Amino acid sequence: APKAVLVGLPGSGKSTIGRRLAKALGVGLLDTDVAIEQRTGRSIADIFATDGEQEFRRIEEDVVRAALADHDGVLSLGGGAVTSPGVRAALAGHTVVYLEISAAEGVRRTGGNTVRPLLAGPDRAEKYRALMAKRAPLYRRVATMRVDTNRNPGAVVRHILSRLQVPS
């Protein structure tokens, strides 16, 4: 099972922190979005565009569940994976690091030309707020560790490592 599962909104630092945390723990990084792409042979964007969000979530849930069983490193979940009840259920018992970000910094971090089905213009800020407001309690319910990332990646990682190692 994963040493740590990373959850957070897009732009919260999953890929950055994941790479750095993985390195620090001497383990591999798996991103569930990449495994979805690997397994389906299809882009995340095409599944959304053609098949729709709900089929995406079921695929995503299956991939999350397998990864929770087969991956021994740091696992990062796509931002909406916690909207699925069965994903939250499967996360029970795991080490789950919620990377928290404010709207304004998250907006700022997600601004370039990455294709994002649920966060395209115009009005990305509005859309970011709606995703944050809706998902905050969902991230909170699965998290075993809340990490404010609004700090330096290196710092965030030292904090995570520390908190993985010692009693509450």
Ligand SMILES: Nc1ncnc2c1ncn2[C@@H]1O[C@H](COP(=O)(O)OP(=O)(O)O)[C@@H](O)[C@H]1O
């Ligand atoms: N702890 C942090 N503080 C400030 N900026 C960060 C931090 N972690 C990541 N970033 C920045 O946020 C952007 C997106 O980070 P990323 O790791 O791709 O988030 P996610 O993978 O959750 O979408 C990048 O520009 C990255 O440099």
Ligand SMILES: O=C(O)C1=C[C@@H](OP(=O)(O)O)[C@@H](O)[C@H](O)C1
């Ligand atoms: O917010 C979401 O629901 C999504 C976030 C993406 O993952 P990241 O959070 O890694 O960008 C990806 O799974 C898809 O576009 C849906």
